[PDB]
Design a protein around this ligand. Structure first.
Ligand code: 3PP
Ligand code: MN
Ligand code: MN
Ligand code: NA
Length: 613
C-alpha cells in the first residue's frame, strides 16, 4: 500500500527479489530499509561467484589485501579503536532486570548487563535512522547448525559490511537454500550497521568503517532480535557467533528444554575401535582450540573435531545427550598458533581463509607472536598497523586479539559426523581453567549436582588476577545465571536422561619456580584416555575431598620423562579452605537470592569434606 513512492524498496534490490522472500522476511528487510535508508539491497545467495566478486571489490577499495603466498587467503587491518568484542557495550533487554541477571548482594553484577526497553529504544533511535545512507544493505540468510538438523536455528542478518558477509559465509551456512528451508518458519532477526552513513561525518581510519562512541550490541530475547551498531569486529558484527549461538540461544534453550553452551565438541576413538564424544568448556586462553584439534601422542588413539567453540545439546527420546556444532567455521585467536601448539589449525588456514589484524610477510604470508617458525633471510614483516616491523620492536606485529576465519570442512581431522542432522552422543563434559596453584591435573565430579557446582565454581588466571568464569559463560549468559544453574540441575529429573560424567582439568599448574608441571598439547590425550575409561566404569579412580582423581599408575605416563605426579595431583587443605571460602562469597554476592538449593548444598558438602582432611 502506498499514497506515494517511498515504502516499496523493490527498485533498490540489486540481487534477488523482495517478492520471492517469505512474508516475514520481506517485512524485516523492508522495514529496516525504510529505517536505515540503504542505497541498495543485496539478497545474498551464498554462491562462490557472489563471494569471489565481493572479495575482489573489497580488494579494489583497500578494505582487504590478498595474501599471495596462500590459496584464496585475505587480510583485513582494522581501525585500532575497533579490535574486539566490547563487553561494556554489550546488553540484554528484558522487562525485569532479574530475568537477565541476578541482583547482587554487595556490588555490581559480573554476570551480565541489563538495559531497560525504554533506555534501548532511545539508544536505538539515536543510532539507526539513516545509518546505511550511501551503502548496500546485505541480507544474509543463515542456518546455525546443519541445514537439515532438528537442532538447527535460522537467522537473517542485515548488514552494511561486505567483511561481515564474507565472514558469515565461512562461519555459518548462508544463502538461497537457507531461505528455501526457512519458508514461513520462525527466524532470529539480526540487524547490524558499522554506523557510518555516507557522506562520512568522521574520518575513515585504515579503510575500516566503525563508530566506537556509539558502539552497542543488544539482545532482545523476547522479540527474537539482535541489534548491533558501531563495530565491524568479530563477536560484535558476526551475529551468529556469540549474540545468537550463546546469548539468544541459551534463552531459547531454557524455554525449550535444551542447552546452548560455550563448549568444544570432539570425538575420541581408542585402539579397540570404540568411539566417544566429549564436550568441554574453557575460558579464554586455556587451549580450547588446541584440545578440539589435538594430535594425540598415544598410539592407536584418534581425535576428531566436531566444533571448537559452541555446542547445542538436547537429550533425545532414548535419553542420549545429542550435540551439534551450530557453526560452519573456526574464528580463532591467531597469535600463539604454531606447529607445536596446533598443527591441525596450521593445515586448515592455508586455504580460503580471512585473517584479521595479523602481520604480513614480504612474500605475502601471515605472521604473529608465537608462530614458532623462522623466516628465510630477506623476508621482512609488515605489522597489523601497516608499518615495518622488527623482532627487536617493543610492540607486537599482530594484535593480541587478531583472528583467522576458516572453513570447518578444511580441518584435516574434522569429524565424519560433524554435520550429521541428529548430532553426536555426548558421554563426558569437561570444565577447566588456568590455575598455577592448588588445582590437580584432572578430577571427576562426584555426581551430576556436584558437577554443576564444579562448572559454577570455575576460576581462571586472566600481579596477575584470578577471576570467576562459571561454565566459561560469564560474558555470554542469555538470562539469569541462577536460573541457568537451576536449568542444568533439572536435567537430573528428566526420566531416561543419560547424564554425562563431569570432569575438571588444569593443564596449567606450576611448581615453586613457575614451571608447568604438565607438558600438555598432544600429551593431554593421556588425560582423555583416563576419562574414557571412567565413562566405561573402569576402577581407575581414587576418592578425594574435591572429587575422584586417577589412582597411582592409572594414568599412562610412558614416553614422558619424570613427571612430578605428587605436585600435579597434590591437594592442600589450606588451599582448598581458601578456595571454598571465596567460591562461597562469590556465589552469595553474584547469585544471591537465585542460587539453587543444590548448589548451596554442594558448597556446604565441599566445605565439610575439606574440614575433615
Ligand atoms: O567474539 C569474538 O570476537 C571472539 C570469539 P572468542 O572469544 O570465542 O575467541
Ligand atoms: Mn569462544
Ligand atoms: Mn534435584
Ligand atoms: Na583496513
Amino acid at each position: 500500500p502506498q499514497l506515494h513512492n517511498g515504502l516499496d524498496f523493490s527498485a533498490k534490490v540489486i540481487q534477488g527479489s523482495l517478492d520471492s522472500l517469505p512474508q516475514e522476511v520481506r517485512k524485516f528487510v523492508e522495514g529496516n530499509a525504510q529505517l536505515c535508508q540503504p542505497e541498495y539491497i543485496h539478497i545474498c545467495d551464498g554462491s562462490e561467484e557472489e563471494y569471489g566478486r565481493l572479495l575482489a571489490h573489497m580488494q579494489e577499495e583497500g578494505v582487504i589485501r590478498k595474501l599471495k603466498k596462500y590459496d584464496n587467503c585475505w587480510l583485513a587491518l582494522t581501525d585500532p579503536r575497533d579490535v574486539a568484542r566490547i563487553e561494556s557495550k554489550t546488553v540484554i533487554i528484558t522487562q525485569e532486570q532479574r530475568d537477565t541477571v541476578p541482583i547482587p548482594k554487595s556490588g555490581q553484577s559480573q554476570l551480565g548487563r541489563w538495559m531497560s526497553e525504554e533506555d534501548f529504544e532511545k539508544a536505538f533511535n539515536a543510532r539507526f535512522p539513516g545509518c546505511m545512507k550511501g551503502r548496500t544493505m546485505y541480507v544474509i540468510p543463515f542456518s546455525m547448525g546443519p541445514l537439515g538438523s532438528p537442532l538447527a536455528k535460522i537467522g537473517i542478518e542485515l548488514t552494511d559490511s561486505p567483511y561481515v558477509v564474507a565472514s558469515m559465509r565461512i562461519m555459518t551456512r548462508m544463502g538461497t537454500s537457507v531461505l528455501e528451508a526457512l519458508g514461513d518458519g520462525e527466524f532470529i532477526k539480526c540487524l547490524h550497521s558499522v554506523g557510518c552513513p555516507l557522506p562520512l561525518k568522521k574520518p575513515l581510519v585504515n579503510n575500516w568503517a566503525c563508530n566506537p562512541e556509539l558502539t552497542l550490541i543488544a539482545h532482545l530475547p523476547d522479540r527474537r532480535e539482535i541489534i548491533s551498531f558501531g563495530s565491524g569486529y568479530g563477536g560484535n558484527s558476526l551475529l551468529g557467533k556469540k549474540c545468537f549461538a550463546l546469548r539468544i540461544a541459551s534463552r531459547l534453550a531454557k524455554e525449550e528444554g535444551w542447552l546452548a553452551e560455550h563448549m568444544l565438541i570432539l570425538g575420541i576413538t581408542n585402539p579397540e575401535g570404540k568411539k566417544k564424544y566429549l564436550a568441554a568448556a574453557f575460558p579464554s586462553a586455556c587451549g580450547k582450540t588446541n584440545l578440539a584439534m589435538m594430535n594425540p601422542t598415544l598410539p592407536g588413539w584418534k581425535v576428531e573435531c566436531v566444533g571448537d567453540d559452541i555446542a547445542w545439546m538436547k537429550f533425545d527420546a532414548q535419553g542420549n545427550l545429542r550435540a551439534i556444532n551450530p557453526e560452519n567455521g573456526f574464528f580463532g585467536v591467531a597469535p600463539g598458533t604454531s606447529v607445536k601448539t596446533n598443527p591441525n589449525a596450521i593445515k586448515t588456514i592455508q586455504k580460503n581463509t580471512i585473517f584479521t589484524n595479523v602481520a604480513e610477510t614480504s612474500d605475502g604470508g601471515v605472521y604473529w607472536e608465537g608462530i614458532d617458525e623462522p623466516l628465510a633471510p630477506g623476508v621482512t614483516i609488515t605489522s597489523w598497523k601497516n608499518k615495518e616491523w622488527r623482532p627487536q620492536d617493543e610492540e607486537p606485529c599482530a594484535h593480541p586479539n587478531s583472528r583467522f576465519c576458516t572453513p570447518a570442512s578444511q580441518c584435516p581431522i574434522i569429524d565424519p559426523a560433524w554435520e550429521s542432522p541428529e548430532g553426536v552422543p555426548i558421554e563426558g563434559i569437561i570444565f577447566g581453567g588456568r590455575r598455577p596453584a592448588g588445582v590437580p591435573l584432572v578430577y571427576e565430579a562426584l555426581s551430576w549436582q556436584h558437577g554443576v557446582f564444579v562448572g559454577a565454581a570455575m576460576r581462571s588466571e586472566a600481579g596477575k588476577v584470578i577471576m570467576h568464569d562459571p561454565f566459561a559463560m560469564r560474558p555470554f549468559f542469555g538470562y539469569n545465571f541462577g536460573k541457568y544453574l537451576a536449568h542444568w540441575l533439572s536435567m537430573a529429573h528428566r526420566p531416561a536422561a543419560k547424564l554425562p560424567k563431569i570432569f575438571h582439568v588444569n593443564w596449567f599448574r606450576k611448581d615453586k619456580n613457575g614451571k608447568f608441571l604438565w607438558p600438555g598439547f598432544g600429551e593431554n590425550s593421556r588425560v582423555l584416555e583416563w576419562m574414557f575409561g571412567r565413562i566405561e566404569g573402569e576402577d581407575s579412580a581414587k576418592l578425594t575431598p574435591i572429587g575422584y582423581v586417577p589412582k597411582e599408575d592409572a594414568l599412562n605416563l610412558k614416553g614422558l620423562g619424570d613427571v612430578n605426579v605428587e605436585e600435579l595431583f597434590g591437594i592442600s587443605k589450606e588451599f582448598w579452605e581458601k578456595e571454598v571460602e571465596e567460591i562461597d562469597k562469590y556465589l552469595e554476592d553474584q547469585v544471591n537470592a537465585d542460587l539453587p538449593y543444590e548448589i548451596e548444598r554442594e558448597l556446604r558438602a565441599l566445605k565439610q569434606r575439606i574440614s575433615q582432611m
